[PDB]
Amino acid sequence: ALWQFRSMIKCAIPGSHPLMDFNNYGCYCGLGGSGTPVDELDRCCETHDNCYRDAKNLDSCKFLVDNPYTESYSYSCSNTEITCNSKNNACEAFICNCDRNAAICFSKAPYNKEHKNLDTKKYC
Ligand SMILES: [Ca+2]
């Protein structure tokens, strides 16, 4: 599962904190969800969960294969500049390219300080 995704979001977050703060927060973190976010740091979970919808379903390695999240792959870093193991393949390159705009996008969006274990009668 997404466990070297924690390895991933140290790399692309100069400043902000991963999962420990980033996992419980905001409204629609999961497959579908459609209201909107609360702040757009539920909106960086919007992009990685719908890139993951196309990854659980994927033409390069189709799912008699069984390779869902972070098990075989690892990655690269620096600006925020996350990618993959830089010889990067077809389907191993896709699941690490969704976990890229997970790690990068926690530094692109705002943050839920607020929705941080949420309320959403309110936000969604
Ligand atoms: Ca969603």
Domain with residue 58: its CATH number is 1.20.90.10
Residue 42 CA to ligand 1 center (angstroms) comes to 8
User: Smallest Cα–Cα separation from 26: which of 5, 1, 48, 4?
Assistant: 48
Residues flagged as binding site for Ca(2+): 28, 30, 32, 49
Q: Which residues contact 68 (CB under 8 A, 6 or more apart)?
A: 1, 55, 56, 95
Task: Quote the tokens at residue 117.
Answer: 């274990």
For residue 55, which amino acid is it?
A
> How many domains are there within the chain?
1
- 99 as an active site residue: the answer is yes
Method: NMR
Largest CA distance in the chain: 46
Residue 72: how many CB atoms within 10 A of its CB? Answer: 11
3-state secondary structure of 116: coil
Domain enclosing residue 109, as ranges: 1-124
- Retrieve residue 54's tokens: 């196309």
Distance, CA of 121 to CA of 124 (rounded, Å): 7
Catalytic residue list contains 48 = yes
Calpha distance 92→113 (Å, rounded): 33
